[PDB]
């Protein structure tokens, strides 16, 4: 990883999604923040806690064939520079999609529940649990 190069790229990506999801002729509603929050937490859960294995052979005799990207990364270190950044950032989005959604009671169940599906696999008291 490039510690400024990877992180930065991730930041860019999110933004891109927001501007690709925003400015839509059909729906010009400020409820794109919920959409943003909705796509991103389901996008993180697939590529970090669902897809199992490596994307290329010859790592170490398939040592991590039954491992997830958030388990194998950083040689299992609990709190590395990156482990914290990928958990502080999904909750900062939750502050941004609440200043604009006016604390909707209808979107509260569609935002938090999407927040708990990501934050709970990131707990260090779980690991190998499938």
């Amino acid at each position: 990883m490039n510690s400024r190069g990877i992180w930065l790229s991730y930041v860019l990506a999110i933004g891109l999604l927001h501007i690709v999801l925003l400015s839509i002729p059909f729906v010009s509603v400020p409820v794109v923040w919920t959409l943003t929050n909705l796509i991103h937490n389901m996008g993180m859960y697939i590529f970090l806690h669902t897809v199992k294995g490596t994307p290329f052979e010859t790592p170490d005799q398939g040592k991590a064939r039954l491992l997830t990207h958030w388990e194998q990364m950083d040689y299992g270190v609990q709190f590395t520079a990156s482990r914290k950044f990928l958990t502080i950032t999904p909750i900062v989005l939750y502050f941004l999609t609440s200043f604009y959604t006016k604390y909707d009671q209808i979107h509260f169940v569609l935002n938090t529940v999407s927040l708990m599906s990501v934050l709970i696999p990131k707990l260090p008291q779980l690991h190998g649990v499938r």
Binding site: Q78, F79, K84, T87, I88, I91, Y94, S98, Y103, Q105, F108, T112
Partner: peptide
């Protein structure tokens, strides 16, 4: 002006801090 959001929100802010120092 959150109905029940602030109570949940308070836990999150604290959660970041004790996670940040490790």
């Amino acid at each position: 002006a959150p109905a029940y959001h602030l109570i949940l929100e308070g836990i999150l802010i604290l959660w970041i801090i004790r996670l940040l120092f490790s």
